Design a protein around this nucleic acid. Structure first.
Ligand SMILES: Nc1ccn([C@H]2C[C@H](O)[C@@H](COP(=O)(O)OP(=O)(O)OP(=O)(O)O)O2)c(=O)n1
Ligand SMILES: *CC[C@H](OP(*)(=O)O)[C@H](O)COP(=O)(O)O
Ligand SMILES: [Ca+2]
Ligand SMILES: [Ca+2]
Ligand SMILES: [Ca+2]
Ligand SMILES: [Cl-]
Ligand SMILES: [Cl-]
Ligand code: NA
Ligand code: NA
Length: 323
DNA sequence: CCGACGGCGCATCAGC
DNA sequence: GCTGATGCGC
DNA sequence: GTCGG
């Protein structure tokens, strides 16, 4: 399969266990970070001591890598795999809206399967019912050809509402992925900027038009700057797809498109590197950290590249932000 | 030893 | 009613 | 779980 695939699968399994079963989010993030650095390491790891040189691999992961390399398994993961209760909780978190807390609450009350959830819809919130309704569709990848049909509809329909909107498809699509988990749309309008005195009421109008033409079929969440929902290409029916729309102040487009292009791991790595250089980056601003350790005033951003320059990173094209 | 760990929008929960 | 914490996801 | 202070 892959160089060190044994080790990174083992760390991913541990990560998922800590997140889904232990609800130990720091251990989850630790395992995820080690899995990522090892997956990038361009050599066959022969010992835990070799892995321990990598940033994010410590004593405990070195010891697991030693057990895994010597035995071809981890007894801890043997046991977790034996554990029906860990398995039920892991499975239920695959429903959109079910996290570790809901999954444990359900398994505690004997609700372990998709069938058990369908029998107990009164115990689900809206997001979970939609996640359940489209469980299969939401795990199917969107071929780039369909992403292009979807982009055509979104850009066409947004222009119908107001010719001044600019819609940009972000996420894996903007990084040039041949398939995407979902569709991420960044939206700007000239009347919505960082200096706007009142809450924008723009997103509702775009969501309404996409609902009116039956492209958007369901709503998971809706506020003034974020919509999360479900959409479907018109036709055998196409699968229902997740769609996220983010309305970002027009003058903060560079920070917005950097965030919304990802990847998630790239973003986490870039923001961590910013912190070590004395900056904090969010979807809106890059701010310097002062002596008191707190974010100062937003810095001028006149390009996507300016953000990289502040933290002294070589510019990466969207295609080079994947994992 | 210690606290930090990327940063945030929305829905729901929990408590006054 | 309200405000803030937690859950979940981007 | 790992790191930096
Ligand atoms: N934990 C996360 C998740 C996401 N994002 C940002 C970067 C992502 O690229 C973007 C959209 O999130 P998705 O989960 O849709 O990620 P992708 O579009 O990269 O992947 P996929 O093909 O799974 O949709 O949001 C982030 O900063 N942190
Ligand atoms: C992988 C080994 C673990 O590292 P972490 O601090 O999760 C622990 O050493 C296992 O110890 P336990 O929590 O006592 O099982
Ligand atoms: Ca190390
Ligand atoms: Ca889930
Ligand atoms: Ca995406
Ligand atoms: Cl933890
Ligand atoms: Cl963490
Ligand atoms: Na780590
Ligand atoms: Na998304």
């Amino acid at each position: 399969e892959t160089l060190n695939g044994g080790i990174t699968d083992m760390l991913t399994e541990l990560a998922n266990f800590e997140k889904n079963v232990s609800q130990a989010i720091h251990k989850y993030n630790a395992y995820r970070k080690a899995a990522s650095v090892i997956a990038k390491y361009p050599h066959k790891i022969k010992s835990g001591a070799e892995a321990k040189k990598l940033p994010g691999v410590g004593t405990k992961i070195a010891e697991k890598i030693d057990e895994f390399l010597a035995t071809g398994k981890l007894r801890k993961l043997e046991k977790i795999r034996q554990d029906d209760t860990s398995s039920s909780i892991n499975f239920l978190t695959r429903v959109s809206g079910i996290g570790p807390s809901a999954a444990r609450k359900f398994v505690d009350e004997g609700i372990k399967t998709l069938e058990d959830l369908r029998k107990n819809e009164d115990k689900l919130n809206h997001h979970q019912r939609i996640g359940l309704k489209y469980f299969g569709d939401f795990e199917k990848r969107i071929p780039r050809e369909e992403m292009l049909q979807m982009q055509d509809i979104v850009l066409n329909e947004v222009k119908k509402v107001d010719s001044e909107y600019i819609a940009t498809v972000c996420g894996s699509f903007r990084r040039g992925a041949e398939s995407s988990g979902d569709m991420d749309v960044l939206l700007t309008h000239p009347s919505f900027t960082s200096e706007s005195t009142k809450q924008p009421k723009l997103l509702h109008q775009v969501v309404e038009q996409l609902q009116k033409v039956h492209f958007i079929t369901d709503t998971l969440s809706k506020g003034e700057t974020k919509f999360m929902g479900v959409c479907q290409l018109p036709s055998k029916e196409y699968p229902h797809r997740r769609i996220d729309i983010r309305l970002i102040p027009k003058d903060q487009y560079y920070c917005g498109v950097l965030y919304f292009t990802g990847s998630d791991i790239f973003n986490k790595n870039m923001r961590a590197h910013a912190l070590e250089k004395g900056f904090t980056i969010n979807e809106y601003t890059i701010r310097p950290l002062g002596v008191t350790g707190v974010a100062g005033e937003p810095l001028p951003v006149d390009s996507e590249k300016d953000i990289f320059d502040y933290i002294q990173w070589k510019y990466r094209e969207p295609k080079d932000r994947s994992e």
